[PDB]
Amino acid sequence: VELTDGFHVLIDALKMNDIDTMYGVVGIPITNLARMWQDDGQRFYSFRHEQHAGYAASIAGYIEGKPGVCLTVSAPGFLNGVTSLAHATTNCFPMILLSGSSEREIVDLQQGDYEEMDQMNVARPHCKASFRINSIKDIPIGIARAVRTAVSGRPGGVYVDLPAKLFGQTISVEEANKLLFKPIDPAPAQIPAEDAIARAADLIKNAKRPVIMLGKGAAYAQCDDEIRALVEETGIPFLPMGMAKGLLPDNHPQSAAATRAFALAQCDVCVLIGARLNWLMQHGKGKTWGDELKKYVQIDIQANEMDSNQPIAAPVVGDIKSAVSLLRKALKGAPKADAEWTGALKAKVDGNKAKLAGKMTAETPSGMMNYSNSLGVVRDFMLANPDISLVNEGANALDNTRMIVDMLKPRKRLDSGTWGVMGIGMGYCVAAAAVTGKPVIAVEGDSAFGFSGMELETICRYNLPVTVIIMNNGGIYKGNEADPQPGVISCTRLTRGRYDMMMEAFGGKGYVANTPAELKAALEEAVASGKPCLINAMIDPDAGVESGRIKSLNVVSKV
Amino acid sequence: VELTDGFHVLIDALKMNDIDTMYGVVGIPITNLARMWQDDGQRFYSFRHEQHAGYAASIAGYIEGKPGVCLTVSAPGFLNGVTSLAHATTNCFPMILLSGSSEREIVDLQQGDYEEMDQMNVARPHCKASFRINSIKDIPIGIARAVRTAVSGRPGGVYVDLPAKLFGQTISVEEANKLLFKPIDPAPAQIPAEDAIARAADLIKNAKRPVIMLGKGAAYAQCDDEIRALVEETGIPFLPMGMAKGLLPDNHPQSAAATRAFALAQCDVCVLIGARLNWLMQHGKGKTWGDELKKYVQIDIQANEMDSNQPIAAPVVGDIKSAVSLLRKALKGAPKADAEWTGALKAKVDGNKAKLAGKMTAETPSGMMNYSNSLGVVRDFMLANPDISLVNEGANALDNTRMIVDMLKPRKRLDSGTWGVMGIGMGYCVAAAAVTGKPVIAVEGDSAFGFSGMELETICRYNLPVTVIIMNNGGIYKGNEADPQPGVISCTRLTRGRYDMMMEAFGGKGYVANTPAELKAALEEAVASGKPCLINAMIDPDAGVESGRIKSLNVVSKV
Amino acid sequence: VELTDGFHVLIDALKMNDIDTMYGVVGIPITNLARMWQDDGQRFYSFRHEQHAGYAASIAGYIEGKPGVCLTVSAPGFLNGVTSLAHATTNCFPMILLSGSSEREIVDLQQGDYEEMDQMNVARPHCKASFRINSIKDIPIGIARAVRTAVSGRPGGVYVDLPAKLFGQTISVEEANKLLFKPIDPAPAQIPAEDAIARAADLIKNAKRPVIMLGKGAAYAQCDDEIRALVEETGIPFLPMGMAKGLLPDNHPQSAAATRAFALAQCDVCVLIGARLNWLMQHGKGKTWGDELKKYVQIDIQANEMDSNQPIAAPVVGDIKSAVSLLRKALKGAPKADAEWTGALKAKVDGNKAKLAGKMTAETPSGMMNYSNSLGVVRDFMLANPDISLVNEGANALDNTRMIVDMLKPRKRLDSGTWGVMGIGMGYCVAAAAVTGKPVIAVEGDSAFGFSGMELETICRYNLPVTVIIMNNGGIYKGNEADPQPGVISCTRLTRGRYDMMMEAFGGKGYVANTPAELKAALEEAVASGKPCLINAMIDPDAGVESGRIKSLNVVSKV
Ligand SMILES: CC(C)(COP(=O)(O)OP(=O)(O)OC[C@H]1O[C@@H](n2cnc3c(N)ncnc32)[C@H](O)[C@@H]1OP(=O)(O)O)[C@@H](O)C(=O)NCCC(=O)NCCS
Ligand SMILES: CC(C)(COP(=O)(O)OP(=O)(O)OC[C@H]1O[C@@H](n2cnc3c(N)ncnc32)[C@H](O)[C@@H]1OP(=O)(O)O)[C@@H](O)C(=O)NCCC(=O)NCCS
Ligand SMILES: CC(C)(COP(=O)(O)OP(=O)(O)OC[C@H]1O[C@@H](n2cnc3c(N)ncnc32)[C@H](O)[C@@H]1OP(=O)(O)O)[C@@H](O)C(=O)NCCC(=O)NCCS
Ligand SMILES: Nc1ncnc2c1ncn2[C@@H]1O[C@H](COP(=O)(O)OP(=O)(O)O)[C@@H](O)[C@H]1O
Ligand SMILES: Nc1ncnc2c1ncn2[C@@H]1O[C@H](COP(=O)(O)OP(=O)(O)O)[C@@H](O)[C@H]1O
Ligand SMILES: Nc1ncnc2c1ncn2[C@@H]1O[C@H](COP(=O)(O)OP(=O)(O)O)[C@@H](O)[C@H]1O
Ligand SMILES: Cc1ncc(C[n+]2csc(CCOP(=O)(O)OP(=O)(O)O)c2C)c(N)n1
Ligand SMILES: Cc1ncc(C[n+]2csc(CCOP(=O)(O)OP(=O)(O)O)c2C)c(N)n1
Ligand SMILES: Cc1ncc(C[n+]2csc(CCOP(=O)(O)OP(=O)(O)O)c2C)c(N)n1
Ligand SMILES: [Mg+2]
Ligand SMILES: [Mg+2]
Ligand SMILES: [Mg+2]
């Protein structure tokens, strides 16, 4: 005659869908779900703010391809978590945000309930679907919907609202076991038509100057050998987007990443694989594409992404593994890309890399490192230790790290993404550490870091093998902007503080690095320790430029 | 350097996407769009209310498989039209609502502009996507995005906001030539994996009492010979939903439609093809399905529709043509459905139809026909004249017509749909007439009809071959409900009026049919005439039941 | 031990708040509420579409100053009703939209429930507040909130969602009577500060060329003697907005309505009383105000309406009765407005009225009346019969009727309003007839009429003393627009049909008027009959201009 309850049926339902981890912050009305999650034997990571719990869930979805689960409380907690859900949806990362909510009777009459919000309706602009499980019997189906909505199609955020009265509901164990079920094939393959592939095959076979653009959807797809086999069999030069670095090793001879401007302006055919033609690509128009409409081949699971920005000549709609498998067989035996195109790009790549190596070896005063020589140490380390996640965010700290730090392994580089978010660092660190079981290095702008810095304590509390490298130049872009008025600090200034001391305040290992040699030693020691560390790398306050590579996007007064 | 403007570029862009028809109502700011559309040699149907121009667009989309286009004015006009957009999206009908909108400056500051509304944001819940084209250079891409969103994936409504200032913008004709383009493959094939098909084939193969449910998604797919070859090769009994009637001829030997309750309740495997397990299927639970969980196969283009209500043993995700084509090859040579199961349902169907024949053949007083003998006439007409669109809405008027009137051809029956909308009648009539160029018969409940009845004048003004049959029983369900108080008319009562006089008021032909013989002679004459007609079929006020077949869904006071 | 239920507690609660009338359309899940409303002895008006039920509720709120109550069904019915709620909110008319909705469990998981919609969340852009009563015990409080939100502050639409499961809930009679209560003072007076009034008093006392603008909020206020006493004591010339006609008799010697352009362009101080400076006033800027910022005094209950468009020099925030009472005492004994300002305007008024009388007496062919001589008959009739509601809508039909037809009594003229809505006519007629118990005349554009025409049957079914005058010129603005192509009708054309026949089809009295004399006789006979009548006034198809007075707002192609 045994009875179960809503707490347990939700635990069983999440387990049934292969969820063993949540990230969140406890409190009414969901503390005892968090407790019982752990009692059952599943891991819960408590954070210092729900936002960073949510950035954690978001990147766990990217890495694994099953939704990261974030757990928050009502109204204020939910709001913090849904800013992260918003982010997940924008980047196409599977993520379920679960939140407690209050009394339906009181919320609907807007009477002033404890943490009152229509969280279901507030979530809607920020996810693919916003649900609410009202009754115990619908938990399994409710969770199935959330998982399918997150993983299927273009993947993304789902919000599941959990009224406080869901949890204390009861049901027989025989009924619950009756209702509990595991979805068949929640992220199905979607195969494109033969003519879609043949139209693409035609454009590529006739290309004089082809290029392949790999985006983070391609990385997410987890079909690395087959994407690489496409590149190698076709002989086509390729470029990775920010988080597509390492999908093919960044030192692959066919990479044109070190000659991007030229390669994009001069190509005729451009093969977009899991890459939107959004602002990161200047919308497929302007001088970055030579002021012309290229012949775009585009592979994407989202049908209506095609023609979003420019006319796509060969739209291939489907999942990237399926599409790429067919395109390869379609291109089988075709001649390789033009040898004087591939040669021209390689000569540019060689030359630009020789030029960068010169900057990385240059000497600077103690405590006045620049971005080249500081990050040249991380470059060298990551070439030797590739099986490590690189978390990265900032302006100059992000741009220069993407240029300098070669990724040899896929799904390791985790950065600001589609929205250029400052705030993802410490959440990404916890999640990368949790889901990989391997070391994490973070290259943080100091401003960037301030958006999630308190989570240092969380990294310490779980004893995670994470090394936070702070690029401490004392401000946003630069740390030397003049006081606008007598004794008034500039808006872009930050305290050139002892972030190493802060790390040590919570049981972490703090370092200061005033030279490339000090940073090299500290990084090697930090990673090898297998312990929470922070390296306070001292960068020249005059080293950076305004907004890094995207300076031109700034609005300036001409009066 | 000759110039063109927004008016002409929009027209060209629409034409390039194979749109040649718009349904709407003119006025500030879009009257001169409609005129210029007509001047260019395309067709504009002006209605008496935008809702009906809208329902006209939605069903044009269903029948043609390219989106119907509704044009309306700002705030109030838009609102009227958006209610129809909502319905399209709910029914998976491709549709685009183009609405003029007011001044951004003024609307954004909520200052009280002419017909002030943020129509783009207000449209959000009622459509797949809600766009705005602010600039003349973005019209080709804006129209491409609208088209692709309406017809790709699960089809549905798209709203496109056309601010007043868009139209008077100018651009060189040469630059406009450069910007105009035709989307490649806007409604692409999506093919399922081998193992998804193999799982479904193995369910069907080992089924003891299988059944195929055909929904209006299977009808919409326009792969009638694939769907029929699957039914006939597998030997599986099938059942159509309201608008799937005629996809296979309703009198097909394998149809278990006339024995639905017993087939649904007793099947072990149920193959849903373009049919949601929503309220029309009692959500796959309850007495209707014998209080058990069936083994569902389900073919649908929308991945997250699976497990929406009940677990789906074999989910096959893709477009129905692609999926059915593959499933057919997988099952090739497999035994046909159990003979004692197909024959058992056939005996049930024969005896059931023989019972209905007796009801249709029976005799009633003059001016007091029932639903059987009145609609028995329309049944006979449509069997001999199947190439005619059948528009249908009401309670008893709908339910009984669905039962009685056999459809032998696909995409002819157009009814209330997923939301059970009273109001679709006269717009459906105008669009069916315009896109098919063939006759239409409408079986309208007298209440149903009053939601769109003023559009008789539209049907007359365009001289359309539409024969509206009003089932005039004098109210909602029944026309005899007693006066609740002395000299106070009940809320369900309607004037048992001369709808024939109303039709003739606008130049149409009117009939009153008091007997089956009078209805038959009027229908044969009306349909043969090729002119706008209305038959006022006088039905017994006491012939109906509460809410028809779904009378149990009513909430009653038990005190 | 007696039990009541949700149906009855809602009836008692509405009764308790002085509601004795609803307008709507029945069907699941609210038919038996409608039935029991009547059983109890309260009136229910069933319409042919929920939209017009809602336009009825909206104008019943304006007229009475207690919210009009509209009742609809779920999803599709709600949508139709909420287009009207939207309208109520925009015009500041108190109105409660009550709608049935479906199962919370199924709607929240978006599973496909009968008429599935989050109606509560869909309503939000279109009302002041959107509530949902989930439980029987909260009905009295739920209704109290709705009534207060509708009547208090700036009055407006409220949506109350009524889940199907609300109605079948039970409670003891002693509990229900315990919970049932009548709000104290739901539309409270709001008195402005002495300095607000003194700032206004200062501007008026120093005015060389003052004008008072009366809007429909002033009419709604129901303080006619005191508003008139302000005008008369100050000697200031005044202008009424569309529905403020008759607040003071339109033939008042101080009216500058017949010299509007001059009065507005030339004034220094402008006293806005319950009138927004929205598009109806060209936003307080441009040539209609002489290209200058006037010194505006503005009385409004909505604090943040001040400075919405132009800087307001003397903002007086409060309810108009309270404000006007204080301003009068503040102006007591002050000299009257400049005699050569008042004289100059009177000379213009006299002259322009003499000019209009000349057009009203001019002869036209049979069946080719113009707007002056046709409406000059209605003018003369309304001067003799002022205690009658004039419903009015159209382009030329509205503009010319506002100019020509003098209202001597307040809250009688009911027109298209802030949004210039075509669709309000027949609903306004039913409601005006219901709440006044007196005759109604409608002056309808023929296009205008088509948006609500089927409700003719509703007017007949309740035997209402309503006379519909159709201004039948055969189209939108004009009825003579050339066929754009061979045998293709223009988009602005309408059938010059026999709307008299349509009226008679439902038991009404139909007239055709081909001359002013025929229209005069028909109108006198129609009103005096006390019965549902329609007069099909035949207007010259070439008589009207594009969009009437607001022609310049049209967007035209210059290429
Ligand atoms: C928008 C964006 C995609 C544009 O790309 P980009 O910066 O112009 O190009 P890349 O970052 O790939 O490369 C930078 C330059 O270094 C060069 N380079 C790249 N890799 C190199 C390598 N390994 N060795 C030598 N040179 C290299 C490239 O050639 C390029 O210069 P080029 O344009 O003259 O060819 C990119 O700047 C970006 O992802 N921005 C994110 C900014 C953000 O969101 N942060 C927060 C906002 S303040
Ligand atoms: C909900 C719904 C799908 C349920 O299906 P249903 O009505 O029970 O089943 P059908 O309409 O297919 O068939 C009706 C009955 O007539 C019988 N029948 C069907 N076709 C027949 C035929 N041509 N000859 C003889 N009998 C027939 C069936 O056996 C069935 O009864 P059963 O339960 O004993 O088997 C259906 O009622 C529906 O589409 N409702 C829409 C109503 C609506 O929109 N309401 C408007 C607002 S009030
Ligand atoms: C926008 C609006 C407020 C502007 O006001 P307007 O039309 O310029 O001014 P009025 O309607 O009060 O008066 C019209 C003219 O007739 C004159 N007039 C008014 N009453 C008169 C009378 N009784 N005798 C003689 N002349 C009169 C006025 O002097 C004015 O002309 P003027 O500007 O040269 O002085 C007005 O046109 C309006 O309410 N429009 C509504 C349109 C709508 O919503 N319909 C649907 C849109 S198509
Ligand atoms: N499995 C998959 N197969 C194909 N496309 C995918 C898959 N997962 C995600 N996508 C698509 O990949 C794209 C990711 O692009 P974007 O986030 O812009 O990448 P980047 O910023 O790296 O260019 C999205 O358009 C998304 O629809
Ligand atoms: N071309 C297509 N291929 C596959 N599925 C489709 C296609 N077009 C529409 N659909 C699906 O068909 C379904 C229609 O179901 P529904 O509207 O409930 O039909 P019914 O009411 O007849 O059961 C939707 O779930 C939709 O996603
Ligand atoms: N009792 C009241 N006292 C004061 N102001 C009111 C009252 N009721 C409504 N109002 C205000 O009256 C105004 C009505 O203006 P509007 O609808 O633009 O009128 P018009 O169109 O006639 O100019 C609104 O701004 C509203 O806030
Ligand atoms: C939440 C959020 N706030 C603000 C910004 C704008 N922004 C871009 S980069 C940046 C910080 C740049 O400074 P830093 O992280 O120290 O990198 P640096 O250039 O100094 O190396 C900010 C605030 C943002 N992208 N996200
Ligand atoms: C817009 C809208 N309003 C109300 C309803 C509720 N409703 C369902 S059926 C129906 C009409 C039933 O009467 P009728 O059309 O005459 O069919 P009958 O049963 O009398 O044959 C109504 C109003 C609805 N479905 N849609
Ligand atoms: C719901 C809605 N649709 C469209 C319009 C645009 N509109 C303004 S007036 C008008 C009709 C004008 O014709 P009519 O009513 O016959 O008046 P007339 O000028 O011919 O006398 C229309 C459709 C509107 N205001 N509201
Ligand atoms: Mg910095
Ligand atoms: Mg009826
Ligand atoms: Mg007209």
Q: In what order do the strands lie in the sheet with A389-393?
A: A413-414, A389-393, A440-445, A466-472, A533-538, A509-513
Q: Is the peptide bond before C155 cis (omega within 30 degrees of 0)?
A: no
Q: In what order do the strands lie in the sheet with B68-72?
A: B43-46, B21-24, B68-72, B95-101, B157-163, B129-132
Q: What DSSP assignment string belongs to A117-139?
A: --HHHHTGGGSSEEEE--SGGGH
Task: Say yes or no for a CB contact (<8 Å) between A314 and B188.
Answer: no
CB C315 within 8 A of CB C302: no
Nearest by CB to B145, which of A148, A183, A304?
A304
CA B480 from chain centre, in angstroms, equals 31
For C63, counting Cβ atoms within 10 Å of its Cβ (0-12 exposed, 13-18 middle, 19+ buried), the class is buried
Task: Say yes or no for a CB contact (<8 Å) between B192 and A196.
Answer: no
Task: Say yes or no for a CB contact (<8 Å) between C109 and A135.
Answer: no
Same domain, A166 and A194: no
Ligand 9 pocket, residue C445 CB under 6 Å: yes
**Greatest pairwise CA separation for chain C in angstroms:** 80
Ligand 8 pocket, residue B447 CB under 6 Å: yes
Which ligand 3 atom sits nearest the alpha carbon of residue C398?
Answer: 45
| Domain end position, chosen among B188, B209, B225 | B188
Same domain, A76 and A92: yes
The residue written with tokens 């703010």 in the block is A49
CB B186 within 8 A of CB B148: yes
**Domains: count for chain A:** 3
Helices (H), A437-473: 446-450, 456-461
Q: Which domain CATH number covers B38?
A: 3.40.50.970
Give the Cα separation of B17 and B2 in Å (integer).
24
Give the Cα separation of B394 and B547 in Å (integer).
9
Same domain, A100 and A194: no
Q: Which residue of B has its CA nearest to C87?
A: B76
For residue A280, what are its two tokens? 């990161």
Strand partners, B70: B23, B97
Task: Say yes or no for a CB contact (<8 Å) between C134 and A110.
Answer: no
The sign one gets for the Cα dihedral B555, B559, C2, C8 is: positive
Beta strands, E only, A275-329: 295-300, 314-317
Same domain, A207 and A340: yes
Our CA angle for B207, B211, B214, nearest 5°, is 140
Same domain, C24 and C160: yes
Cβ neighbours of A131 in C, within 8 Å? 108-110
- Reference C426, options C45, C55, C137; nearest CA is C55
C320 is in an annotated binding site: yes
| DSSP 8-state code for residue B470 | E
Cβ neighbours of C448 in B, within 8 Å? none
Q: Are strands C440-445 and C413-414 parallel, antiparallel or unpaired?
A: unpaired
Ligand 9 pocket, residue C151 CB under 6 Å: no
Q: What DSSP assignment string belongs to A161-204?
A: EEEHHHHT-EEEHHHHHHH----S-SS---BPPHHHHHHHHHHH
Strand partners, C171: C4
Same domain, A195 and A113: no
Same domain, C447 and C433: yes
Strand partners, B71: B24, B98
Chain A: which residues have CB within 8 Å of chain C?
Answer: 104-105, 108-110, 118, 120-121, 129, 131-135, 138, 141-142, 145, 161
Strand partners, A4: A171
Give the Cα separation of C7 and A516 in Å (integer).
79
User: In which element (H, E) is residue A36 found?
Assistant: helix A31-40
Ligand nearest to the CA of B220: 5
Give the Cα separation of B52 and C80 in Å (integer).
12
Q: Which residue of C has its CA nearest to B84?
A: C76
Helices (H), C408-543: 425-436, 446-450, 456-461, 499-504, 516-529
Nearest by CB to C105, which of A105, A118, A134?
A134
Q: What DSSP assignment string belongs to B93-125?
A: --EEEEEEE--HHHHHTT---TT---HHHHTGG
Mutate to test the pocket of ligand 3, among C87, C239, C260, C478 (most ligand atoms within 8 A of CB): C260
Ligand 9 pocket, residue B343 CB under 6 Å: no
- Reference A200, options A324, A314, A328; nearest CA is A314
- Reference B444, options B374, B388, B507, B382; nearest CA is B374
Return phi, psi of residue C263, to 5°.
-55, -40
For residue A446, give the 3-state DSSP assignment.
Answer: helix
Task: Say yes or no for a CB contact (<8 Å) between A148 and B317.
Answer: no
Q: Are strands C129-132 and C295-300 parallel, antiparallel or unpaired?
A: unpaired
Same domain, B411 and B535: yes
Cβ neighbours of A141 in C, within 8 Å? 109
| Å from CA of A418 to ligand 1 middle | 14
| Structure determined via | X-ray
- Reference A238, options A204, A272, A279, A190; nearest CA is A272
Q: Which residue of A has its CA nearest to C138?
A: A105
Q: What chains are in contact with B, requiring at least 3 Cβ pairs below 8 Å?
A: A, C
For residue C42, what are its two tokens? 């309260």
- Which residues have C-beta within 8 Å of that of residue C126, sequence separation ≥ 6? C82, C83, C85, C86, C89, C157, C159
For B347, counting Cβ atoms within 10 Å of its Cβ (0-12 exposed, 13-18 middle, 19+ buried), the class is exposed
Q: Which domain holds residue A522?
A: 348-559
Same domain, B536 and B551: yes
Any residues with Cβ below 6 Å from ligand 3, and which?
Answer: C 242, 257-261, 280, 352-353, 356, 395, 398-399, 402-403, 416, 420, 547, 549-550
Compute the CA torsion angle C516, C522, C526, C527 (nearest 10 deg): 30
Q: Which domain CATH number covers A203?
A: 3.40.50.1220
Give the Cα separation of A315 and A200 in Å (integer).
8
For residue A511, give the 3-state DSSP assignment.
Answer: strand
Q: What chains are in contact with C, requiring at least 3 Cβ pairs below 8 Å?
A: A, B
For residue C490, what are its two tokens? 């223009």
Give the Cα separation of B382 and B390 in Å (integer).
9
Same domain, C18 and C117: yes
Return phi, psi of residue C512, to 5°.
-115, 135
Ligand nearest to the CA of C477: 9
**Greatest pairwise CA separation for chain A in angstroms:** 80
CB B14 within 8 A of CB B71: no
Give the Cα separation of B65 and B42 in Å (integer).
19
Q: Count CB atoms within 10 A of the CB of residue B386.
A: 16
User: In which element (H, E) is residue C52 found?
Assistant: helix C50-64
Give the Cα separation of A364 and C430 in Å (integer).
87
CB A243 within 8 A of CB A213: no
Give the Cα separation of A332 and A353 in Å (integer).
33
| Å from CA of A449 to ligand 10 middle | 9
Give the Cα separation of A153 and A189 in Å (integer).
9
Q: Count CB atoms within 10 A of the CB of residue B346.
A: 17
Give the Cα separation of A390 and B397 in Å (integer).
67
For residue B543, what are its two tokens? 């012939």
Strand partners, C68: C95
Cβ neighbours of A125 in C, within 8 Å? none
Q: What is the 3-state secondary structure (H, E, C) of C217-244?
A: HHHHCCCHHHHHHHHHHHCCCEEECHHH
Which ligand 6 atom sits nearest the alpha carbon of residue C91?
Answer: 17
Return phi, psi of residue A478, to 5°.
-130, 165
CB A476 within 8 A of CB A395: yes
CB C401 within 8 A of CB C416: no
- Quote the minimal CA–CA distance from C163 to chain A in Å: 12
Nearest by CB to A109, which of C105, C108, C142?
C142
Strand partners, C154: none
How many CB pairs (< 8 A) connect A and B?
Answer: 107
For residue B523, what are its two tokens? 């229908």
Strand partners, A131: A160
Which ligand 9 atom sits nearest the alpha carbon of residue C446?
Answer: 16
- Reference C232, options C209, C255, C215; nearest CA is C255
Q: How many CA atoms lie within 13 A of C340 on its CB side?
A: 1
Return phi, psi of residue C22, to 5°.
-130, 155
- Reference C328, options C204, C221, C242; nearest CA is C204
Task: Say yes or no for a CB contact (<8 Å) between C129 and A142.
Answer: no
Q: How far is CA C222 from CA B34, C68, C134, C322, in A?
A: 44, 17, 36, 12
Q: How many CA atoms lie within 13 A of C187 on its CB side?
A: 22
Which residues are close to ligand 11, an ion, with C-beta < 5 A?
B 445-447, 473
CB A263 within 8 A of CB A256: yes
| Domain end position, chosen among A309, A328, A347 | A347
Give the Cα separation of C52 and C24 in Å (integer).
8
Q: How far is CA B3 from CA B31, B55, B164, B171, in A?
A: 21, 36, 19, 6
Q: Count CB atoms within 10 A of the CB of residue C549.
A: 14
The residue written with tokens 């639409």 in the block is C157
For residue B120, what are its two tokens? 């783009």
Give the Cα separation of C475 and B465 in Å (integer).
23
Q: Are strands C389-393 and C440-445 parallel, antiparallel or unpaired?
A: parallel
Helices (H), C361-445: 371-384, 396-404, 425-436
| Domain end position, chosen among C143, C161, C188 | C188
How many CB pairs (< 8 A) connect A and C?
Answer: 44
Our CA angle for A247, A251, A253, nearest 5°, is 100
Our CA angle for B453, B459, B461, nearest 5°, is 120
Resolution (A): 2.2
Chain A: which residues have CB within 8 Å of chain B?
Answer: 129, 141, 144-145, 148-149, 152-153, 181, 183-185, 188-193, 196, 199, 303-304, 306-315, 317-318, 322
Give the Cα separation of C367 and B285 in Å (integer).
65
Give the Cα separation of B346 and B338 in Å (integer).
12
Same domain, C317 and C457: no
Return phi, psi of residue A512, to 5°.
-115, 135
Q: How far is CA A206 from CA A200, A269, A270, B182, C180, in A?
A: 10, 9, 12, 22, 80
Give the Cα separation of C7 and C167 in Å (integer).
5
Q: How far is CA B202 from CA B192, B277, C79, C264, in A?
A: 16, 22, 45, 82
Ligand 4 pocket, residue A406 CB under 6 Å: no
Same domain, A59 and A159: yes
Q: How far is CA A537 from CA A471, A511, A514, A520, B417, in A?
A: 5, 8, 6, 10, 65
For residue A164, what are its two tokens? 């406080």
Which ligand 8 atom sits nearest the alpha carbon of residue B423?
Answer: 1
Task: Say yes or no for a CB contact (<8 Å) between B303 and A152.
Answer: yes
- Measured distance between the N- and C-terminal CA atoms of chain A, rounded to whole angstroms: 80
Nearest by CB to B318, which of A190, A308, A313?
A190
Q: Which residue of C has its CA nearest to B112?
A: C278
Give the Cα separation of A477 and B49 in Å (integer).
58
Q: In what order do the strands lie in the sheet with C95-101?
A: C43-46, C21-24, C68-72, C95-101, C157-163, C129-132
For residue B335, what are its two tokens? 């035994």
- Which residues have C-beta within 8 Å of that of residue B384, sequence separation ≥ 6? none
For residue B45, give the 3-state DSSP assignment.
Answer: strand
